Amino acid sequence: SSQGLLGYYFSDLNFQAPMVVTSSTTGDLSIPSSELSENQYFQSAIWSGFIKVSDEYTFATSADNHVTMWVDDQEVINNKIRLEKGRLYQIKIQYQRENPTEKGLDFKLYWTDSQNKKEVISSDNLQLPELKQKSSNSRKKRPDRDNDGIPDSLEVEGYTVDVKNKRTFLSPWISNIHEKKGLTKYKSSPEKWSTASDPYSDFEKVTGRIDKNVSPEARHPLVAAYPIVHVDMENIILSKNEDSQTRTISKNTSTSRTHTSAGFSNSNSSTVAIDHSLSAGERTWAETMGLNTADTARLNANIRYVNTGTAPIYNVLPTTSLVLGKNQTLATIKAKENQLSQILAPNNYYPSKNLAPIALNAQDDFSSTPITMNYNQFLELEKTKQLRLDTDQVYGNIATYNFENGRVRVDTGSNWSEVLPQIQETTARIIFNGKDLNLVERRIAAVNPSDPLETTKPDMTLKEALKIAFGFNEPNGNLQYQGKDITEFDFNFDQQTSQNIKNQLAELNATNIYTVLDKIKLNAKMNILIRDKRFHYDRNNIAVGADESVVKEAHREVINSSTEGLLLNIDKDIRKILSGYIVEIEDTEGLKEVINDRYDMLNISSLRQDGKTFIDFKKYNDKLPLYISNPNYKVNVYAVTKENTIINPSENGDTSTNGIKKILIFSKKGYEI
Ligand SMILES: [Ca+2]
Ligand SMILES: [Ca+2]
């Protein structure tokens, strides 16, 4: 399907000004004009590839007088010649006619065997040229300095790819034509086989000869294809270390990928929040588990892997540490190499969500290691109610397109450990939480002034990178992420890159960046950060708050209400930074009665299967609705955001909601309900 030969077609006479770059699967190297105006006249054209077969052959084309043909560097056209079953031969073909009266080029390629069967060279005996930074022992490689297949001028001057029903075209970019048609205009360094410096050529990327599992956005030459993994623990379950009654504490967790300032760190970490709610009694966990001073405890949890990246992993999963406190590693989760039941795809889990999560200590695994804590680690644990999950960047082997057989395959000689150094070396990183408020990294090829090779890649402008990498557009002129204006998110950098940007603005006589993004330029090693303005973000850049206005507003559209609970319409996004609600009744004088006056009893919201939110007033009022012994009493519901979420009885022990900073979001009389 992606096999055959590779044609350059120049409008000029000498392979100087390339019009179309394409491939035919059989011998017929034609191109109907039905597939292309003042430029549709090729005065020269080249064709490159190999050939496999045993017999005595004679090559003939439909123009043995405009052509030259070499098989393994020997001339054959400007006569019979022997070939052998099970060997490949280079194949170069040139063409030149001085004033082609027609548009396009009709040109087939024949071969006649010994029985005299002449014909066009089947697609089964035709293979591409080995466009790859290195030569195989079967195939060798030789206006394509980086050898990626896309001709130099084209890679410098821009090029587009029209996806015809058989094969693809690669042609110069033209404003009047493709600009209206909305075809994506490409550019890329002619001296990088791959410009985002990853493992797919600038050629494989645009022509679809690439691991299908790679992100559509990373199909761009300047958008970097590479994995990004983190471990999403989904919940947890604690035991006393060794015939007594089941004495454990099972609780959900919430895990978010993190980035600590922007900061030049390339690590993969995420941070677990063990739920602090109510699971009968206000017992300490040792009181809940019969743990003594000199006891031990052990941990278990279902965890999935998360690729928030653009390339996929195949045979080796990255090794995690379960750290507690700042640096106390309780465990080291490993997966069994070259044995991955499935692949882990970008924007996707392993095990898939339709399947089970991994348990740290799987059912019948006799070699699963006890994750143990001493006593003061266990207190420590309850105190902080949180564990971190650092994950290396050993990702194993890569699925590289094979040219000879036009098939994508895991390739043993190509490892992700030999590529990340340079991706992260010669690209500028961006981190955006615009999607479901999660930190999502990406990287874009950007000029490295103090490095001559990185000054051969096209310029990358802020406005552009957002569009190629993250999919902004400008439907009416203003730049947008799936609805939201680019002004809705803020810009953080790290320090060197901040200075850098600052400087540029003074130069453009600009005072506001949002209105000069197109003019801002991106250099390699830049780190950038972009977060929805509506929110407060902790030191790990996770969303953990909001304005009192943002929240109150969010909850303003109430649907129904009753002495049994509120039924609102709240944004999935707001709903992500809320940790619970408080319910109280205000008598006529001003006293307040707290229906659920505990720090682990605030979990009374439950998202319906219809998208709306219901606030179960009954859940902690003893399954009873609310009793209002005077209609002029008010029913007041505050909201509590994660940043003001108490998770342990105060210093004096008071386990009430007393003191908790919360937000009034609903108030009505007994008679207003
Ligand atoms: Ca090239
Ligand atoms: Ca290139």
Swiss-Prot record:
Residues 1-225 are annotated as: Domain 1, calcium-binding. Changing residue 172 to A: Loss of ability to bind to LF and completely non-toxic. The record marks 366 as: Phi-clamp. Gene3D superfamilies: 2.60.40.810, 3.10.20.110, Protective antigen, heptamerisation domain (2.60.120.240), Toxin - Anthrax Protective Antigen,domain 1 (3.90.182.10). Changing residue 203 to S: Impaired translocation of LF. One of its GO terms (cellular component) is extracellular region. Changing residue 303 to C: Loss of capability to undergo conformational changes that lead to pore formation and translocation. Changing residue 475 to S: In strain: BA1024. Residues 169-177 are annotated as: Alpha-clamp. Residues 243-258 have a biased composition (Polar residues). The molecule is folded into four functional domains. Each domain is required for a particular step in the toxicity process. Domain 1 contains two calcium ions and the proteolytic activation site. Cleavage of the PA monomer releases the subdomain 1a, which is the N-terminal fragment of 20-kDa (PA-20). The subdomain 1b is part of the remaining 63-kDa fragment (PA-63) and contains the binding sites for LP and EF. Domain 2 is a beta-barrel core containing a large flexible loop that has been implicated in membrane insertion and pore formation. Belongs to the bacterial binary toxin family. This is Protective antigen.
